[PDB]
């Protein structure tokens, strides 16, 4: 990281069609990790290739097979992009055609083009290929949306986008979580955990479905059947689907009614105002499974025992244990609830000590699995352990204030309010909105594609349809996306019969009323159906007093061990610029490592007295000892008061 | 108190709000300024909600003259490339001409965009939210409804293919790659800039950590001369903004009479700075940390005001930390000849009366054309139909029109530079 | 509440011991652990008047740490005032803040008297205001105070004072951007005006009514002003009246 | 109210000529207050008293 510089992290022209120029991390890893493009492949030498169609006399030969080519090969040829438009059969239309020649962009007559890219999405990756109306977005917001599409959470009931891009059924078949029938027959057994299909004339095929498993990121990897018993099924037809797929294709978010307008400050600076329907309709609710582990070791005093004979505990807190000291499957555990009961033989009967495993503060849910592993059962336990108990706890999380919501075009936000549906603005038919977004965030960020999807999604809801628009769709017309959206909205207006759906004066805007007063807003606003995602991640942390570091006696850091927040040197500078002296001195000594002043301050606060003056923090004494240990005679001195006296060395370590 | 507010009978953008907040702080205090800011926040939040401000695809209005402008530009480009193909111009002159052509087309389109917004729909949501200064710029409305313009390679070379589409119309695959170049460049810049900015701030903090205010006066008679910061003809920072919070080291006097405007050792508030600017002193000698002779620090009189409070600095204020933080905070906030020259076009049809007065030496311009280079500042004389010409050339100018020619309406006449 | 009950635990314990029937620290701690209703009342009467310091992770300048007064809210997120976002350079798209609580009396006094957010108005680096309204507030004020020739229902009507004009707008008699006349006596700054009176009419008396572009002043012959009518928009009336009410109160 | 305390604070910050010195005085006063009261919050009462004493 320290050696990689500006040159290495940039886009080299030779990345065209082999490495995506959009999908990367942000921060120290920007430009150092990339993603393979959609059609790119690696040959047996290790060089990335990419496919092209041959062009003979200006005619694209799609009859012949794609000719793959590496970066060095396609430097002497004039290669046209995949968005060039051809007429019936294959001839290239136009008079000037953009080409790449020797890592440069030029234009040529369409009789001197050697190769043409296979698809318009050949230059981007798979996550970036899933963003509709991408050519109406900035590249930075496209990066944000592509990165955030991979942090979406599988929801309780997934739903396909209405303005999908066409790569969704292909982006879900590779994760190996969707089950498709390889056989053209009938379905004979359907169950929550098993599917069976009998070939029209042949053997039976049986599939087992994963149910409420756990991923590396604590999400749920469910699998559900789609078909019903005694159903005619064709080969390649979807039979079961994953946790983020609906019927074949990827489904990471939900389609909700959105309006672009400011609320009473709840839209301020990327904040999001949503309705209460997203909570009680179980939209954007997810299942998260966590794993807790307990270890039975062997101490020099003795071994550790898992039992319900826990000291200093009453029978009101041992209700859900399985008469072996371990909680039962299907029990609801709240915070601080015992999961596995363990006793250690401490040395000082009334000798056992309690270190049973309990739920961390802020965690609750159902217990779904309690697996036990002991050396007797033929399991590979750790070197010094004698029992490993693992408990899995699942919970359902609803959308709430503080959660992150996102769209496919890079528009992120944090939910700041959840309004009752009789306070949210509503349509000329009585339908309250689901989310209100600030339009102040659209034009300065140049992600106009979100304003196209909404509108097309609106049409799709009204026409009971689903649109598959592919990126860079303007090779067919002058303004293809806008014309398609306007025509679709007009068609929806004619089919439904409601004139308020679409207006000719303001195409994308319709009238919206105020749910609090019933008065319409001064001007119509943009409403539509938007496909929004709920992002992962449990961040709230607080501390008063907890564990401390070994050498410096400073509080530990980390949420999982009651850690403190670091007061860096920039904050010290900020407090110095304020003129603060007492806040700074209390932060630096009494609240971090004044090993004796911490207890005095805490005792004074509890008793209600005044906090006494601090002393020398422990890190300073550690540093003086280390400097002395470096053969330095550094010391602290007290000056002599009178004349004929020597300065006296002060003993800090006392 | 006691200062009655003025009835602002005008539109209120961000500049007016900032001016009002500053006035309120200066006249009413810091808690009435807080109250006023909260009230304005409430009012703005309420009436930004009653308005129903939104964003649409038709709200992004592209001028209807974009197509004809692009057609004219492309016609000029074809003429240039045909000249290049015939050997009349060299390759770096074809490149220069097509770059200048697309930079002027971009400027014209931006002007037309702004005029179309301010003429057809002055209450457009995009125009309303970009012109009021809430969330937006002009380099962003340009890329939404105008034309993206000329971009650069990942190495720095200007790609002669410009982006001629907005985000409303949608880029092509080629324009997406050309845009992604600069997007990634900015991303990597931010990632690698954050560490450098932090390091600079740390070094600044350690150099000037011991600068605390310990004295009241060092009793000197030295200081520097504060004057406006000007780029020749134009000024960049006025003298009144540079004279606020300073302490005068000598009594200033109006240059019209013997009226004193400040005595020696007097802090300058906004009113006195404005009065000095108005009267055109152009130079004021002030005390400074540069010239104060104290004990390893500055004194209160040489420092002057603390800008967060609009008062003289207190005793024992760590001004070094404040200086380091002030320099380091905006640390993370750190195409060819366009309007930096000026084409002179005569909107008249008349004969040429240049003769042989000015020193016209034949010259080959940055494009492939040949003109006359002039270094002697001379007033152009041309029979501009009804009446003559009073045009003034500058040293080093390039005139295209020579004598014995017929100038038409808005024909290119000259080029004036503005100040291997 | 989840953060506050942990940050202020010693204070809650002290107030449970003193002002209630709690005997020892262990009983108070177990009462806090079981989330007794009394706990929240004690915490609410503890944190009032107790400043708390908020910091954003990159502290580039001294305004990156500012003191506030806590208000117990239900949720997992810290509610921040929108006017302090530019000082912290914070936006609500995933940003996080750190909360510290001063302990000693000197620390609380310093936080309230020096670091309080209501006292940080000017930028210490340039002297310019830093709590100015931005984004939606600016857009709303601009829309309120703008001029809209399309919607001018009730234009030209005269009003006794600012309150009368505001009440007329509230009913709906006069549109938001209508050009009305209000009898306002005071200093008026109107852009696009003319220092030259547009029309001067001397009546059958020593009284001249100079009619400017946005004003109508009746002045006694070789005398003083008798009345002033300002031609304005009820939105501008609302804006100026809000400013005046904030200043007077 | 909170606003009242804010106005009294601003009132004391001015006429003191040293924000630090007046913060130290408020701290001291509030300390004595709570001490001779344990026998409203200290800093608040201190500021109220000092404001009411400035006449």
């Amino acid at each position: 990281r320290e050696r990689a510089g500006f040159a290495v992290r940039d886009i080299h022209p030779s990345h065209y069609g082999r490495i995506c120029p959009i999908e990367t991390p942000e921060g120290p890893n920007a430009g150092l990790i990339g993603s393979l493009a959609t059609h790119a492949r690696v040959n047996d030498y290790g060089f990335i290739e990419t496919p092209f169609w041959r062009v003979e006399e200006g005619r694209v030969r799609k009859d012949l097979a794609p000719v793959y080519m590496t970066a060095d090969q396609e430097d002497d040829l004039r290669v046209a992009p995949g968005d060039v438009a051809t007429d019936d059969a294959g001839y290239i239309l136009g008079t000037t055609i953009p080409v790449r020649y020797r890592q440069d962009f030029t234009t040529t007559t369409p009789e001197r083009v050697d190769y043409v890219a296979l698809s318009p999405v050949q230059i981007i990756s798979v996550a970036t290929s899933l963003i509709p109306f991408l050519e109406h977005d900035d590249a930075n917001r496209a990066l944000m949306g592509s990165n955030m599409q991979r942090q979406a959470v599988p929801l309780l009931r997934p739903e396909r986008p209405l303005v999908g891009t066409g790569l969704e059924p292909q982006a879900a078949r590779d994760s190996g979580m969707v089950i498709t029938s390889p056989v053209d027959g009938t379905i004979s057994y359907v169950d929550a955990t098993h599917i069976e299909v009998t070939a029209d004339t042949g053997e039976k095929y049986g599939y087992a479905l994963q149910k409420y498993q756990r991923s590396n990121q604590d999400t749920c990897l469910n699998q559900r059947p789609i078909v019903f018993e005694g159903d005619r099924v064709q080969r390649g037809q979807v039979i079961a689907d994953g946790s983020a797929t609906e019927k074949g294709e990827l489904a990471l978010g939900q389609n909700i009614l959105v309006a672009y307008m400011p609320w009473e400050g709840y839209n301020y600076e990327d904040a999001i105002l949503i309705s209460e329907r997203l909570v009680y309709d179980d939209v954007y609710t997810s299942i998260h499974i966590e794993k807790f582990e307990i270890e039975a070791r062997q101490t020099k005093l003795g071994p550790e025992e898992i039992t319900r004979e826990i000291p200093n505990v009453g029978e009101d807190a041992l209700r859900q244990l399985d008469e072996n000291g371990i909680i039962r499957v299907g029990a609801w555990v709240e915070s601080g609830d015992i999961l596995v009961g363990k006793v250690t033989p401490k040395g000082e009967a009334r000798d056992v000590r309690d270190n049973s495993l309990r739920v961390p503060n802020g965690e609750k849910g159902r217990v779904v699995d309690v697996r036990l592993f002991t050396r007797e059962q033929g399991d590979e336990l750790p070197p010094g352990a004698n029992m490993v108990v693992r408990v899995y706890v699942a919970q359902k999380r609803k959308i709430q204030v503080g959660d992150k919501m996102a769209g496919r075009h890079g528009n992120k936000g944090i939910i700041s309010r959840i309004l009752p549906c009789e306070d949210m603005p509503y349509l000329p038919d009585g339908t309250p909105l689901d989310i209100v977004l600030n339009p102040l965030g659209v034009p300065s960020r140049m992600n106009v594609g979100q304003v196209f999807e909404c509108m097309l999604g609106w049409a799709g809801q009204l026409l009971d349809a689903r649109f598959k628009v592919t990126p860079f769709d303007e090779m067919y017309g002058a303004e293809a996306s806008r014309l398609t959206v306007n025509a679709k909205l007009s068609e929806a207006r004619e089919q439904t019969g409601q004139p308020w759906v679409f207006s000719d004066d303001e195409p994308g805007k319709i009238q919206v009323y105020d749910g609090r007063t019933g008065e319409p807003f001064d001007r119509p606003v943009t409403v539509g159906r938007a496909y929004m995602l709920k992002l992962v991640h449990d961040k709230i942390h607080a501390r008063s007093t907890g564990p401390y570091s070994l050498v410096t006696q400073q509080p530990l850091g980390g949420k999982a061990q009651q850690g403190g927040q670091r007061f860096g040197e920039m904050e010290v500078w900020a407090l110095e610029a304020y003129g603060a002296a007492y806040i700074l001195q209390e932060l630096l000594t009494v609240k971090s490592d004044d090993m004796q002043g911490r207890n005095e301050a805490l005792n004074a606060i509890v008793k209600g007295k005044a906090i006494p003056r601090p002393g020398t923090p422990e890190s300073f004494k550690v540093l003086m000892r280390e400097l002395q240990s470096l053969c330095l005679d550094i010391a602290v001195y007290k000056a002599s008061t009178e004349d004929y006296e020597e300065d006296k060395e002060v003993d800090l370590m006392a | 108190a006691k200062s009655a507010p003025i009835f602002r009978n005008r539109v209120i953008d961000k500049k007016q709000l900032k001016k009002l907040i500053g006035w309120t702080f200066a006249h009413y205090g810091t808690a009435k300024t807080a109250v006023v800011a909260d009230d304005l926040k409430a009012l703005g939040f309420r009436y930004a909600t009653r308005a129903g401000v939104s964003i649409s695809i038709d709200d992004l209005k592209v001028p209807g003259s974009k197509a004809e402008l692009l057609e004219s530009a492309e016609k000029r480009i074809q003429e240039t490339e045909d000249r290049y193909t015939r050997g009349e111009i060299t390759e770096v002159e074809r490149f220069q001409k097509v770059i200048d052509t697309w930079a002027n087309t971009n400027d014209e389109l931006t002007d037309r965009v702004v005029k179309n917004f301010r003429e057809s729909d002055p209450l457009n949501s995009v125009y309303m939210m970009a012109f009021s200064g809430a969330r937006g710029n002009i380099s962003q409305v340009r890329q939404l409804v105008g034309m993206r313009g000329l971009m650069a390679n990942p190495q720095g070379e200007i790609i002669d293919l410009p982006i001629k589409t907005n985000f409303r119309e949608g880029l092509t695959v080629t324009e997406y790659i050309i845009s992604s170049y600069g997007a990634r460049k900015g991303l990597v810049d931010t990632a690698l800039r954050t560490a450098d900015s932090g390091y600079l701030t740390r070094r600044l903090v350690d150099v000037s950590q011991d600068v605390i205010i310990h004295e009241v006066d060092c009793g000197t008679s030295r200081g520097l001369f504060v004057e406006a910061m000007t780029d020749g003809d134009r000024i960049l920072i006025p003298i009144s903004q540079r004279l606020l919070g300073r302490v005068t080291a000598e009594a200033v006097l109006d240059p019209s009479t013997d009226e004193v405007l400040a005595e020696a050792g007097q802090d300058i508030n906004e009113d006195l700075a404005n009065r000095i600017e108005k009267a055109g002193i152009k130079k004021v000698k002030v005390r400074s940390p540069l010239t104060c002779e104290a004990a390893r620090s500055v004194c209160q009189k040489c420092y002057g005001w603390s800008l967060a409070h609009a008062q003289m600095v207190d005793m024992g204020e760590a001004v070094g930390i404040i200086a380091a933080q002030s320099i380091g905070e905006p640390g993370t906030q750190l195409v060819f000849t366009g309007e930096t020259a000026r084409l002179l076009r005569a909107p008249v049809a008349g004969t040429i009366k240049l003769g042989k007065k000015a020193r016209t030496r034949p010259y080959r311009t940055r494009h492939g054309e040949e003109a006359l280079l002039a270094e002697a500042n001379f007033d152009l004389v041309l029979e501009g139909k009804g009446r003559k010409e009073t045009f003034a050339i500058l040293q080093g100018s390039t005139i295209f029109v020579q004598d014995g020619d017929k100038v038409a309406a808005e024909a290119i006449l000259a080029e004036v530079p503005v100040s291997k | 509440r989840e953060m506050a009950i942990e940050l202020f635990q010693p204070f809650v314990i002290h107030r449970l011991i003193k002002n209630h029937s709690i005997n020892n620290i262990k009983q108070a701690k177990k009462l806090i652990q079981k989330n007794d209703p009394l706990i929240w009342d004690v915490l609410e009467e503890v944190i009032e008047g107790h400043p708390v310091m908020l910091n954003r992770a990159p502290t580039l300048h001294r305004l990156g740490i500012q003191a506030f007064e806590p208000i117990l809210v239900e949720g997992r997120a810290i509610q921040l005032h929108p006017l302090v976002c530019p000082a912290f350079n914070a936006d609500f798209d995933g940003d996080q803040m750190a909360v510290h609580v001063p302990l000693s009396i000197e620390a609380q006094a310093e936080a309230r008297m020096l670091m309080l957010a209501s006292g940080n108005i000017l930028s210490p680096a340039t002297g310019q205001p830093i709590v100015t309204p931005s984004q939606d507030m600016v857009l709303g004020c601009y829309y309120l105070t703008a001029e809209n020739p399309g919607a001018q229902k009730g234009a030209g009507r005269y009003f006794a004072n600012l309150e009368d004009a505001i009440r007329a707008f509230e009913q709906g008699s006069v549109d938001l951007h209508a050009w009305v006349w209000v009898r306002f006596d005071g200093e008026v700054e109107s852009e696009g005006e003319s220092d030259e009176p547009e029309s001067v009419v001397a009546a059958d008396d020593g009284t001249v009514t100079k009619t400017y572009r946005f004003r109508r002043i009746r002045e006694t012959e070789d005398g003083q002003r008798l009345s002033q009518y300002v031609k304005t928009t009820p939105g501008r009336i609302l804006f100026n009246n809000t400013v005046q009410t904030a200043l007077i109160h | 109210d909170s606003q009242d305390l804010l106005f009294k604070a601003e009132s004391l910050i001015v006429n003191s000529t040293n924000r630090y010195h007046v913060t130290l005085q408020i701290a001291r006063r509030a300390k004595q207050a709570r001490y001779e009261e344990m026998e409203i919050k200290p800093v608040l009462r201190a500021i109220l008293e000092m404001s009411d004493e400035l006449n």
Partner: peptide
């Protein structure tokens, strides 16, 4: 150095 040792900094309210 008063920050490192843990004394009142000689600036601000800790000036004297």
């Amino acid at each position: 150095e008063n920050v490192i040792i843990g004394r009142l900094i000689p600036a601000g309210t800790g000036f004297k």
